[PDB]
Design a protein around this motif. Structure first.
Motif, PDB file in Angstrom:
ATOM      1  N   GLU A 183      35.466  19.527  37.581  1.00 27.58           N
ATOM      2  CA  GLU A 183      35.298  20.870  38.128  1.00 27.58           C
ATOM      3  C   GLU A 183      36.053  21.902  37.298  1.00 27.58           C
ATOM      4  O   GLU A 183      35.509  22.960  36.961  1.00 27.58           O
ATOM      5  CB  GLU A 183      35.755  20.906  39.586  1.00 27.58           C
ATOM      6  CG  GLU A 183      34.770  20.271  40.557  1.00 27.58           C
ATOM      7  CD  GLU A 183      33.412  20.953  40.533  1.00 27.58           C
ATOM      8  OE1 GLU A 183      33.338  22.159  40.857  1.00 27.58           O
ATOM      9  OE2 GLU A 183      32.421  20.282  40.176  1.00 27.58           O
ATOM     10  N   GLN A 184      37.313  21.616  36.960  1.00 26.72           N
ATOM     11  CA  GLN A 184      38.078  22.562  36.154  1.00 26.72           C
ATOM     12  C   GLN A 184      37.460  22.753  34.777  1.00 26.72           C
ATOM     13  O   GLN A 184      37.520  23.854  34.222  1.00 26.72           O
ATOM     14  CB  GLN A 184      39.529  22.107  36.032  1.00 26.72           C
ATOM     15  CG  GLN A 184      40.376  22.487  37.232  1.00 26.72           C
ATOM     16  CD  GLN A 184      41.861  22.314  36.982  1.00 26.72           C
ATOM     17  OE1 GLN A 184      42.274  21.540  36.117  1.00 26.72           O
ATOM     18  NE2 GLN A 184      42.675  23.040  37.742  1.00 26.72           N
ATOM     19  N   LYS A 185      36.854  21.705  34.216  1.00 23.58           N
ATOM     20  CA  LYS A 185      36.121  21.865  32.964  1.00 23.58           C
ATOM     21  C   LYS A 185      34.976  22.858  33.128  1.00 23.58           C
ATOM     22  O   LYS A 185      34.782  23.742  32.287  1.00 23.58           O
ATOM     23  CB  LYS A 185      35.593  20.514  32.485  1.00 23.58           C
ATOM     24  CG  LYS A 185      35.171  20.500  31.023  1.00 23.58           C
ATOM     25  CD  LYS A 185      34.088  19.465  30.770  1.00 23.58           C
ATOM     26  CE  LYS A 185      32.795  19.850  31.477  1.00 23.58           C
ATOM     27  NZ  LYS A 185      31.715  18.842  31.276  1.00 23.58           N
ATOM     28  N   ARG A 186      34.208  22.729  34.212  1.00 24.03           N
ATOM     29  CA  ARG A 186      33.121  23.669  34.468  1.00 24.03           C
ATOM     30  C   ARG A 186      33.652  25.087  34.636  1.00 24.03           C
ATOM     31  O   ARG A 186      33.125  26.035  34.043  1.00 24.03           O
ATOM     32  CB  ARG A 186      32.339  23.241  35.708  1.00 24.03           C
ATOM     33  CG  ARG A 186      31.147  24.128  36.010  1.00 24.03           C
ATOM     34  CD  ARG A 186      30.858  24.169  37.499  1.00 24.03           C
ATOM     35  NE  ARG A 186      31.986  24.719  38.239  1.00 24.03           N
ATOM     36  CZ  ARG A 186      32.037  24.816  39.559  1.00 24.03           C
ATOM     37  NH1 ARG A 186      31.034  24.415  40.319  1.00 24.03           N
ATOM     38  NH2 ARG A 186      33.124  25.325  40.130  1.00 24.03           N
TER      39      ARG A 186
ATOM     40  N   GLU B  21      38.988   8.855  41.999  1.00 25.41           N
ATOM     41  CA  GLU B  21      37.733   9.595  42.081  1.00 25.41           C
ATOM     42  C   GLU B  21      37.988  11.072  42.342  1.00 25.41           C
ATOM     43  O   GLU B  21      37.288  11.934  41.800  1.00 25.41           O
ATOM     44  CB  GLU B  21      36.840   9.012  43.174  1.00 25.41           C
ATOM     45  CG  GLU B  21      35.658   8.232  42.652  1.00 25.41           C
ATOM     46  CD  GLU B  21      34.768   9.045  41.737  1.00 25.41           C
ATOM     47  OE1 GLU B  21      34.371  10.166  42.119  1.00 25.41           O
ATOM     48  OE2 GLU B  21      34.463   8.557  40.629  1.00 25.41           O
ATOM     49  N   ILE B  22      38.981  11.376  43.177  1.00 26.20           N
ATOM     50  CA  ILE B  22      39.333  12.765  43.451  1.00 26.20           C
ATOM     51  C   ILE B  22      39.804  13.448  42.175  1.00 26.20           C
ATOM     52  O   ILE B  22      39.357  14.551  41.836  1.00 26.20           O
ATOM     53  CB  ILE B  22      40.399  12.834  44.558  1.00 26.20           C
ATOM     54  CG1 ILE B  22      39.766  12.532  45.919  1.00 26.20           C
ATOM     55  CG2 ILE B  22      41.100  14.192  44.549  1.00 26.20           C
ATOM     56  CD1 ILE B  22      40.743  12.552  47.062  1.00 26.20           C
ATOM     57  N   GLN B  23      40.703  12.790  41.440  1.00 29.04           N
ATOM     58  CA  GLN B  23      41.198  13.342  40.182  1.00 29.04           C
ATOM     59  C   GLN B  23      40.071  13.501  39.169  1.00 29.04           C
ATOM     60  O   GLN B  23      39.941  14.550  38.528  1.00 29.04           O
ATOM     61  CB  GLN B  23      42.305  12.443  39.631  1.00 29.04           C
ATOM     62  CG  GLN B  23      42.717  12.729  38.202  1.00 29.04           C
ATOM     63  CD  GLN B  23      43.731  11.721  37.698  1.00 29.04           C
ATOM     64  OE1 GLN B  23      43.456  10.524  37.640  1.00 29.04           O
ATOM     65  NE2 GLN B  23      44.918  12.199  37.351  1.00 29.04           N
TER      66      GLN B  23
ATOM     67  N   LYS C 209      41.298  19.875  31.185  1.00 33.16           N
ATOM     68  CA  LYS C 209      42.708  19.608  31.441  1.00 33.16           C
ATOM     69  C   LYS C 209      42.904  18.618  32.587  1.00 33.16           C
ATOM     70  O   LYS C 209      42.203  18.669  33.598  1.00 33.16           O
ATOM     71  CB  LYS C 209      43.456  20.908  31.747  1.00 33.16           C
ATOM     72  CG  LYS C 209      44.143  21.537  30.540  1.00 33.16           C
ATOM     73  CD  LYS C 209      45.078  20.545  29.849  1.00 33.16           C
ATOM     74  CE  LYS C 209      46.144  20.004  30.796  1.00 33.16           C
ATOM     75  NZ  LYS C 209      46.972  18.947  30.145  1.00 33.16           N
ATOM     76  N   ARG C 210      43.873  17.723  32.418  1.00 33.90           N
ATOM     77  CA  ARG C 210      44.138  16.699  33.414  1.00 33.90           C
ATOM     78  C   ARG C 210      44.862  17.289  34.622  1.00 33.90           C
ATOM     79  O   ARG C 210      45.537  18.319  34.537  1.00 33.90           O
ATOM     80  CB  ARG C 210      44.972  15.569  32.812  1.00 33.90           C
ATOM     81  CG  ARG C 210      44.414  15.022  31.509  1.00 33.90           C
ATOM     82  CD  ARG C 210      43.019  14.449  31.699  1.00 33.90           C
ATOM     83  NE  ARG C 210      42.326  14.260  30.429  1.00 33.90           N
ATOM     84  CZ  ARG C 210      42.233  13.105  29.786  1.00 33.90           C
ATOM     85  NH1 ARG C 210      42.778  11.999  30.266  1.00 33.90           N
ATOM     86  NH2 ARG C 210      41.570  13.056  28.633  1.00 33.90           N
ATOM     87  N   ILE C 211      44.707  16.617  35.763  1.00 31.19           N
ATOM     88  CA  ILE C 211      45.421  16.952  36.990  1.00 31.19           C
ATOM     89  C   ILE C 211      46.088  15.689  37.512  1.00 31.19           C
ATOM     90  O   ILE C 211      45.420  14.670  37.723  1.00 31.19           O
ATOM     91  CB  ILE C 211      44.491  17.544  38.067  1.00 31.19           C
ATOM     92  CG1 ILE C 211      43.873  18.862  37.593  1.00 31.19           C
ATOM     93  CG2 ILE C 211      45.260  17.757  39.362  1.00 31.19           C
ATOM     94  CD1 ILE C 211      42.947  19.487  38.616  1.00 31.19           C
TER      95      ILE C 211
END
Ligand SMILES: [Zn+2]
Ligand SMILES: [Zn+2]
Ligand SMILES: [Zn+2]
Lengths: 76, 116, 76
Positions: B103-106, B95-97, B110-112
């Motif tokens: 958030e990074q999309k907003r 869920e964190i990922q 890209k994956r983390i």
């Protein structure tokens, strides 16, 4: 590429690596720096255990990422 | 700049790891459990509960009452010696990922961390 | 881990087990050490007749716990 590795105690070191490097190679670098034997090393990145034969790129390990050295213990 | 992208990504990566690793309260060594009970014995000599992460002194910390299969203990609310937190911790990590990637999309149009 | 199986004759059997072993596995271990077929074995713990498909951890059986074996014989 620069990444970080935290020892068991929490001391942080810095390694130059490439994402194509294997986990074995990264362990060899940790040995060069800290003298820890590779068979004593167990590494975590973003919650996942890093397995021999895999590459850093298999786990999406990118620049400034931190790998964690841990003890794997059996409960009582 | 790109520096903030790195700072956000690595903070998520380290939160994902914090959900997995148990740090010994006595000596600070990072621990994970291969199998067995939730009573851990660190190399420093101190014991800890793998579930609530507190320092303990023996098996008295855990519920030792007989149980009915598929039921919680009716005598106490203490930590269970046998329950495997792996799935719960993996659900927290995922869920964190998931939220972090949204958030990074907003932020960055890209994956983390490692893939599922 | 290690548990004890005591019979109504007072004899104590020591078994090496794991928390994920089922009760069916435990009766197989008893058959191995004592020659008693599982169909003759009733295992009781804290008044509960343990079910073969369940695990030791399902009953919160503890390290060094003692189970009680009561025999039966349908074949005669
Ligand atoms: Zn410790
Ligand atoms: Zn606990
Ligand atoms: Zn209890």
């Amino acid at each position: 590429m620069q990444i970080f590795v935290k020892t068991l105690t929490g001391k942080t070191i810095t390694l130059e690596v490439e994402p194509s490097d294997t986990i074995e190679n990264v362990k060899a670098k940790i040995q060069d720096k800290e003298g820890i034997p590779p068979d004593q090393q167990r590494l975590i990145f973003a919650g996942k255990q890093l397995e021999d034969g895999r590459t850093l790129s298999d786990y999406n390990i990118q620049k400034e990422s931190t790998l964690h050295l841990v003890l794997r213990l059996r409960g009582g | 700049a790109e520096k903030d992208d790195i700072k956000y990504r690595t903070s998520i990566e380290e939160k994902m790891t914090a959900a997995r690793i148990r740090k010994c309260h006595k000596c600070g060594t990072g621990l994970i459990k291969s199998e067995g009970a939730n009573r851990m014995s660190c190399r420093c000599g101190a014991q800890m509960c793998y579930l609530c992460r507190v320092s303990i002194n023996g098996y008295d910390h855990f519920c030792q009452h007989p149980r009915s299969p598929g039921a919680p203990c009716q005598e106490c609310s203490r930590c269970s010696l046998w329950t495997d937190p792996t799935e719960d911790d993996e659900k927290l990590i995922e869920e964190i990922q998931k939220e972090a990637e949204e958030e990074q999309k907003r932020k960055n149009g890209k994956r983390i961390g490692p893939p599922l």
